[PDB]
Design a protein around this ligand. Sequence first.
Ligand SMILES: CC(=O)N[C@@H]1[C@@H](O)[C@H](O[C@@H]2O[C@H](CO[C@]3(C(=O)O)C[C@H](O)[C@@H](NC(C)=O)[C@H]([C@H](O)[C@H](O)CO)O3)[C@H](O)[C@H](O)[C@H]2O)[C@@H](CO)O[C@H]1O
Ligand SMILES: CC(=O)N[C@@H]1[C@@H](O)[C@H](O[C@@H]2O[C@H](CO[C@]3(C(=O)O)C[C@H](O)[C@@H](NC(C)=O)[C@H]([C@H](O)[C@H](O)CO)O3)[C@H](O)[C@H](O)[C@H]2O)[C@@H](CO)O[C@H]1O
Ligand SMILES: CC(=O)N[C@@H]1[C@@H](O)[C@H](O[C@@H]2O[C@H](CO[C@]3(C(=O)O)C[C@H](O)[C@@H](NC(C)=O)[C@H]([C@H](O)[C@H](O)CO)O3)[C@H](O)[C@H](O)[C@H]2O)[C@@H](CO)O[C@H]1O
Ligand SMILES: *[C@@H]1O[C@H](CO)[C@@H](O)[C@H](O)[C@H]1NC(C)=O
Ligand SMILES: *[C@@H]1O[C@H](CO)[C@@H](O)[C@H](O)[C@H]1NC(C)=O
Ligand SMILES: *[C@@H]1O[C@H](CO)[C@@H](O)[C@H](O)[C@H]1NC(C)=O
Lengths: 175, 175, 172, 320, 322, 320
Amino acid sequence: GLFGAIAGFIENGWEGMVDGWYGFRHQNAQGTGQAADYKSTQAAIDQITGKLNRIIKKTNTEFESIESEFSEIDHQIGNVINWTKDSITDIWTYQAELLVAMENQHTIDMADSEMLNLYERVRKQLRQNAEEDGKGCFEIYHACDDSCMESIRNNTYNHSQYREEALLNRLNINP
Amino acid sequence: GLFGAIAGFIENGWEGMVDGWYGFRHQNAQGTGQAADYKSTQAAIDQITGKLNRIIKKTNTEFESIESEFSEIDHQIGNVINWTKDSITDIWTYQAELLVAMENQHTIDMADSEMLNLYERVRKQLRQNAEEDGKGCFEIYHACDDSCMESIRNNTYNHSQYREEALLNRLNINP
Amino acid sequence: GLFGAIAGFIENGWEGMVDGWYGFRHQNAQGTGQAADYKSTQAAIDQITGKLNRIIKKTNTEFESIESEFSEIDHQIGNVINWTKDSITDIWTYQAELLVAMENQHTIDMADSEMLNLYERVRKQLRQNAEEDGKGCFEIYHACDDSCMESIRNNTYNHSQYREEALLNRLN
Amino acid sequence: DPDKICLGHHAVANGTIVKTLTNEQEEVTNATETVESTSLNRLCMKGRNHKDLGNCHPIGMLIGTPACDLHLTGTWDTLIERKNAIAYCYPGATVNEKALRQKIMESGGISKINTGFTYGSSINSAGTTKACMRNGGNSFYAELKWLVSKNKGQNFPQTTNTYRNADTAEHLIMWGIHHPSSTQEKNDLYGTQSLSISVGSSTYKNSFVPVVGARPQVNGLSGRIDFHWTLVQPGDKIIFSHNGGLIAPSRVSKLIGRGLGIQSEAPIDNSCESKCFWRGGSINTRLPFQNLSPRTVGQCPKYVNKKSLMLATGMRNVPE
Amino acid sequence: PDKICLGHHAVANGTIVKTLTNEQEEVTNATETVESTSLNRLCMKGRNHKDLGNCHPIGMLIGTPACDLHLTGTWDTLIERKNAIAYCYPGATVNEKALRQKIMESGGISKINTGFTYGSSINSAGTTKACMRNGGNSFYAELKWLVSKNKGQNFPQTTNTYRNADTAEHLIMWGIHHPSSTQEKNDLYGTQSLSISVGSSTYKNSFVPVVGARPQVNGLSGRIDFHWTLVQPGDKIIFSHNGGLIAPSRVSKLIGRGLGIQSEAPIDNSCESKCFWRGGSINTRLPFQNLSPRTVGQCPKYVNKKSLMLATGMRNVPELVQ
Amino acid sequence: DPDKICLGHHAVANGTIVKTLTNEQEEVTNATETVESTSLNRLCMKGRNHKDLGNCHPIGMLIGTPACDLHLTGTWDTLIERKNAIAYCYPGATVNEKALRQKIMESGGISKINTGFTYGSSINSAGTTKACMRNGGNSFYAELKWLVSKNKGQNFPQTTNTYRNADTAEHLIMWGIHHPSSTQEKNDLYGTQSLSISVGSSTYKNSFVPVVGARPQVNGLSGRIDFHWTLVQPGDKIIFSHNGGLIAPSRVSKLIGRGLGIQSEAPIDNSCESKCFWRGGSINTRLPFQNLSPRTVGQCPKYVNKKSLMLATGMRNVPE
Ligand SMILES: CC(=O)N[C@@H]1[C@@H](O)[C@H](O[C@@H]2O[C@H](CO[C@]3(C(=O)O)C[C@H](O)[C@@H](NC(C)=O)[C@H]([C@H](O)[C@H](O)CO)O3)[C@H](O)[C@H](O)[C@H]2O)[C@@H](CO)O[C@H]1O
Ligand SMILES: CC(=O)N[C@@H]1[C@@H](O)[C@H](O[C@@H]2O[C@H](CO[C@]3(C(=O)O)C[C@H](O)[C@@H](NC(C)=O)[C@H]([C@H](O)[C@H](O)CO)O3)[C@H](O)[C@H](O)[C@H]2O)[C@@H](CO)O[C@H]1O
Ligand SMILES: CC(=O)N[C@@H]1[C@@H](O)[C@H](O[C@@H]2O[C@H](CO[C@]3(C(=O)O)C[C@H](O)[C@@H](NC(C)=O)[C@H]([C@H](O)[C@H](O)CO)O3)[C@H](O)[C@H](O)[C@H]2O)[C@@H](CO)O[C@H]1O
Ligand SMILES: *[C@@H]1O[C@H](CO)[C@@H](O)[C@H](O)[C@H]1NC(C)=O
Ligand SMILES: *[C@@H]1O[C@H](CO)[C@@H](O)[C@H](O)[C@H]1NC(C)=O
Ligand SMILES: *[C@@H]1O[C@H](CO)[C@@H](O)[C@H](O)[C@H]1NC(C)=O
């Protein structure tokens, strides 16, 4: 898709993640874990709620009858009414189809963008302490326990704390 | 937003940048700098001007009166005209609302993309001589004076010139 | 453009590439070469095919005549028909103009994104063994012969084999 | 050897299919319908001073057909017309009938005002018919009088009657013309003289002649009574001059305010509210579109020729 | 070092399209969405069609000589031509526009005998030089011109009744003759006051021949005007008259539905189409057309636009030219 | 420690709120209006050969009502009709009036052609009325003649008048039928005989009978003159046969070309130009939409049910 993450470099979604739209899975010495990301999830949900608020509505214009349900209509006027009503129905049917097709394209691509934005936030946070594997994971070149993993998820990870250790493991370089 | 820069990793805009839409601030030994980027600014302005040229116009169709202002009209023809006019008004009100909502979404996201494309241009220019701080800035690991800063803005920056100095500082192995 | 590759950091297109929409050129000690990329090309083409299937179509509604070609119409109803038909024509002309303008914008940007997605795939494959030059190329810091270049194009390049060599050359 | 943090997104086992600009079968995690397919099979009349006409046709309210006896006057914001409702107990029709019905169905009430018309001793003003039964006997339209000669065969006298609108709003006046089935019948009711009816106001002028002609029996009757109408402006007079054949108004109507006219087959429900009505009942949807009928009244979703149109409310579904 | 370069294709000569932000955007390829060309012919393959030629639709019901080969039939498509003949004798039909549209929406016509017969004092074989058939004076084939057998004598008070014995409604037409003068009126119908009454369960009207001075149309100041109604299943319609009625010998039944086309373009049975206009047929897969707003059938929508190009490729960024 | 370069974008102190697909209150750096809310309270007539009818009703131009004396002929590209304009000085109306008014308001001029009608010694063709005053004297419609018997009470003669269209374009002919207030009046003007007017061309015919009926006084007059009209094709004749009650044309009309009919109360302004007009004046906007009125004429922005629709002309505003 447009932003290359969902149905892209992320191989598949997680059916086990039920508490959010986007999130993290980690692996360290203590074991494995999973957690949803609130900010990216809510960013996507708020945008879809906004679309629904705009789309799920009717006009306030009051229309009256121009066609008798239980009686005959004039033939000349009736053909004009039939042409006009069918022309109006073709317009609304077309507009409905285009609305939902365009909105669906944008919704899918928006969701893709929020996945990428989270990935990009984490990449920049980790700085020179990690490398991308190409599948949506970061290989972290220092011991990163549950508290360290939490700091990455909470956006409080300080790269300077682990930089010396990480560069030694990545590049075999001592200061 | 879609491209993650404006109202994203860039914390806020600069009210003091009045000569352009996008640009650079810098800090070196010589001083503090600010300059607008012409190419990205004009790319955004030209696209918005293009939209305005398409949108700000009316049809050439000449309409005549089908409703008398000062005299009575026939009951059934008048009801059909009222139904038709209100149906056409609902179509144009809907089309106008959708046009401007769609165009505004695209304008905002286009502006976001131009910010990201400038950021990406600078990232690739600097190559291995700088690191991203996550807030839209690059920490440059060599002395980069006013002419050096100007070369980055001009796309004449030569990473090879500074690479040895930069890598020694980045790896913390400067003798 | 939106994704910054086509008419962006890629200076221009290749008129010589006739067997694909996106592809590779390489330069190594042995020589040069060119090859198209199937997956990215097919991704773009399939999306454009999908648009054409959606757009190239008419409604199933059957319309009959409300204006007589060879005889006179009533003056009051005739003016209402003229007003209605012209209003409907203005709506369809506007909708057609907006449809094609919007679809063209999206087609161009979709094509741009597929260029970028290929570029990003290659970047992540090469990992710490290469550096971006800013013009759509990657400078590879180990000897990468024709078989090595083919493995990049085929998505079977394993960075770990060349990493030690590449990091030695990148740092010195 | 390195520790790992992996970024991801959710998925579901069974996704929902939607259409996009580029793909007719795109699977997403969730979607919601935008075209309403369901209707409430009642007329939701809560918050409305409504009138269900039953077997009374709107025009019958003005002329006083027996079926309309409970609907000769009143006020309402919503007026409900039913299928096969009765306007004409005696065979006939109204000239400019569609305009008249529309005007009544747009109103918010009817009041009635006496014409004050009187007739000399040689006129029988209490003509009745088997076609219009009321209270176990031959009757006639309640708001009109069938005038005939009291003595059979005698010439109906030249008569002139005037209704003045003394109100500040326009009134609607109706009258009928009887069209006999034969010369003998015409002679018996109105005499051998040439018959003519003229009607004249400041805004209206017309003349009428009873047409004698053989016709099939409708409810055992070859005679016809056709109705005509016009508006009488405030302060204006309307003058009827006639010598046989006029079905004369005893009252005129005043249409009061505005209301919503509904033609529907659905029963009324006073416990629920609605803004949108059609033949089959009420549409209380929040959705922008509907596929129930192109014929609706009130504040309604737009009709589309589509069974379903699903709007994505989630990302692409990429299952494990 | 060694290098691998990513790129995209281009062409020397791109195609211009319009986008949201650019009126002159160059792309590698594009395709048209507005149809500009029409086939100058009525494409009638797979259609049981009837080309009326110089027969006007109303003439099929009354039986004008030009319509002799179109008195009955079935069709899914009915083609009307310019300057088609409805009336041989000077005159017109009341509510003619509604009648023509009913015929042009039909899928065929059947004819049913009225069974109208007349006494010895009526001449039911009135003819005119205006309505020629087989080189002789004739009349509308579905009607009869009734006059007094003896010139100057009062036409007898006559009653004729048509019963619809069918399960579908029938369309009945009749005429009223309006003589050129009082003397002519007296010759044909006598000196008496004339009156024609028509009455069914659903229809009622009365008519009187008028003799006011009017100019000649092909040498005739007389007029025959036509009137029509629908007779419901099981109902009867009674004509009471004493001179001036042009009475029906048959009634019509319109059968099913069909597509009415008004065009001067010639028939072509080797090709198919679902959309037609005055100038011919529109056979296109494209969503829009700019040929005419007046079309019939299943058509692309009319737009006031010469061209709308849909991009089928990326932005064209050609190599530098000196 | 290290030198730094920072990428950024501008902001403004006072942003503008716009609506997007996902946000009803999105703040941007700038935006512009797409719906015009203001109108000029004038009819902008620069570059137009226009006719302001003032007190003259379009139909009055053809019959020659005193209010229309300066509008009997002319050419124009724009015709302006005003409220309460006068068509009929004498009480009455025109049959098929709406179609006639629209024909005139679609035209680009009127030419008048003499009928050449003459009358014998037993006709007085100079009938006038206090309803149609000119310069303080009883007068009549300029383009017609009220024919009465020269000798009061005598039978109006059996008369013929024929107009031939000698032009290559169709001509519009009008005539009136007088309907007297009483039998005594009818007898005085036309005699005791039965009155009949027939009109006949190759494409048209009709007959008329003056009706004597009681009806209210309009400006002190219970009489009526009703107007009728038809088109006489090139080379055709139209024959009037009459013996009392015809109001005969002294001229016929030819509608020239096409023009824009405007119904408005706003004054003329020759300084400025416009392509769009409504009841309240002119709309000179470059914007695609307007919320002034759904009833407009000319080349106009489309009416929408919205106060404002702001189009973003800048990025998201993110202040410091
Ligand atoms: C009662 C009467 O006035 N005359 C007797 C006729 O009724 C009868 O002929 C039969 O008439 C039948 C219809 O009868 C009414 C009706 O509509 O119910 C009786 C009404 O009183 C009468 N009303 C008035 C105001 O005159 C009404 C009216 O004349 C007609 O509707 C006018 O068209 O007729 C029905 O038509 C039968 O088919 C018919 O035999 C004759 C013969 O027995 O005797 C009369 O004394
Ligand atoms: C006695 C004499 O000298 N008469 C002279 C006539 O030769 C002539 O009168 C015109 O005659 C016309 C006859 O044409 C038909 C027709 O339409 O072809 C003949 C039809 O048989 C007749 N049909 C019937 C059923 O009667 C038909 C019919 O009368 C009229 O169409 C009814 O309007 O007429 C025709 O009657 C003309 O209307 C009549 O003027 C005139 C020269 O015009 O001179 C007479 O002195
Ligand atoms: C023949 C004539 O002029 N007689 C005079 C009477 O009409 C008049 O009685 C008063 O008449 C008033 C209306 O007068 C006119 C009018 O409309 O102004 C006078 C016109 O000359 C006359 N025109 C013609 C062509 O005849 C016109 C016309 O007869 C009617 O409008 C036809 O409906 O009437 C008004 O009705 C008064 O109520 C009435 O008293 C008296 C003088 O007062 O005698 C005659 O001078
Ligand atoms: C209009 O459409 C209705 C419903 O399809 C149909 O019954 C009717 O015949 C049409 N009206 C005319 C005048 O043909
Ligand atoms: C049409 O709408 C106008 C303006 O609201 C109103 O005055 C008129 O009554 C309506 N027409 C009919 C026939 O009800
Ligand atoms: C940057 O561009 C400006 C304007 O062309 C030029 O004057 C200046 O010398 C350039 N500086 C560098 C370092 O490229």
